[PDB]
Design a protein around this ligand. Structure first.
Ligand code: 88M
Length: 108
C-alpha cells in the first residue's frame, strides 16, 4: 500500500518532465475559465482536475491506494474528452499523455 503511492509520484514526475512537455503543458495548472473565455466549462465539467491538484493530493494523504490516484488522473483526461470537440488539439495532446500514464501505471 505504501510502496504503490511512492511509484505514483514517479509517474507524475515523468509526466511533468521536459520529454513529454510538448503535449503535457495544458494539464500542468487548473483550467483557466476567465483567461481562455470558457463560460460553459463549470456547467459541463462538474469535477475539474489537473496535474498540480493530483500532486497536492498525493503530497498530503488523499489517496489510500494507487486506484484512487488513477481515478483522479483518468478524471483529468475524461474532462478533456467531454468538454472539448473530438477534433481539438488538446484532445490529441490528452491521448498522447494518457498513452504515457497507462503504460507506466500498468507496470505496477
Ligand atoms: C480551449 C482549450 O482549453 C483547454 C481545455 C482543456 O480541457 N484543457 C485541459 C486545457 C485547455 C487549455 C488551457 C490552457 N491554459 S491553462 O492555464 O488553463 C492550462 C495550462 C492553455 C491551452 C489549453 O488547450 C489548448 C488550447 C488551444 C490549443 F491550440 C491547444 C491547446 F492544448
Amino acid at each position: 500500500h505504501m510502496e504503490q503511492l511512492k511509484c505514483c509520484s514517479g509517474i507524475l514526475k515523468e509526466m511533468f518532465a521536459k520529454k513529454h512537455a510538448a503535449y503535457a503543458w495544458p494539464f500542468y495548472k487548473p483550467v483557466d475559465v476567465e483567461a481562455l473565455g470558457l463560460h460553459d466549462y463549470c456547467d459541463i465539467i462538474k469535477h475539474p482536475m489537473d496535474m498540480s491538484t493530483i500532486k497536492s493530493k498525493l503530497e498530503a494523504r488523499e489517496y489510500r491506494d494507487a486506484q484512487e490516484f488513477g481515478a483522479d488522473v483518468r478524471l483529468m483526461f475524461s474532462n478533456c474528452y467531454k468538454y472539448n470537440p473530438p477534433d481539438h488539439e488538446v484532445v490529441a495532446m490528452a491521448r498522447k499523455l494518457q498513452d504515457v500514464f497507462e503504460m507506466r501505471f500498468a507496470k505496477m
